[PDB]
Amino acid sequence: GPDIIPIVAGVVAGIVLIGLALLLIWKLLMIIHDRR
């Protein structure tokens, strides 16, 4: 869209960081119940 690119660069970027940050901490959750 018009005058929306600047917004996407910020949001679309953070979206990739959230999906990666969750998968990281995710391993910290399973690593505990892995030995349980």
UniProtKB/Swiss-Prot annotation:
This is Integrin beta-1. It comes from the Eukaryota. Induction: Induced in alveolar epithelial cells during exposure to the fungus R.delemar, a causative agent of mucormycosis. Belongs to the integrin beta chain family. The chain crosses the membrane at residues 4-26. The VWFA domain (or beta I domain) contains three cation-binding sites: the ligand-associated metal ion-binding site (LIMBS or SyMBS), the metal ion-dependent adhesion site (MIDAS), and the adjacent MIDAS site (ADMIDAS). This domain is also part of the ligand-binding site. The chain holds residues 726 to 761 of 798 of the full protein. The gene is ITGB1. Antibodies against integrin beta-1 ITGB1 protects epithelial cells from invasion by the fungus R.delemar, a causative agent of mucormycosis, and could thus potentially be used to treat mucormycosis disease. Antibodies against the protein also protect a neutropenic mouse model against mucormycosis. It is found in: Cell membrane; Cell projection, Invadopodium membrane; Cell projection, Ruffle membrane; Recycling endosome. It comes from Homo sapiens. Heterodimer of an alpha and a beta subunit. Beta-1 associates with either alpha-1, alpha-2, alpha-3, alpha-4, alpha-5, alpha-6, alpha-7, alpha-8, alpha-9, alpha-10, alpha-11 or alpha-V. ITGA6:ITGB1 is found in a complex with CD9; interaction takes place in oocytes and is involved in sperm-egg fusion. Interacts with seprase FAP (seprase); the interaction occurs at the cell surface of invadopodia membrane in a collagen-dependent manner. Binds LGALS3BP and NMRK2, when associated with alpha-7, but not with alpha-5. Interacts with FGR and HCK. (Microbial infection) Integrin ITGA2:ITGB1 interacts with human echoviruses 1 and 8 capsid proteins.
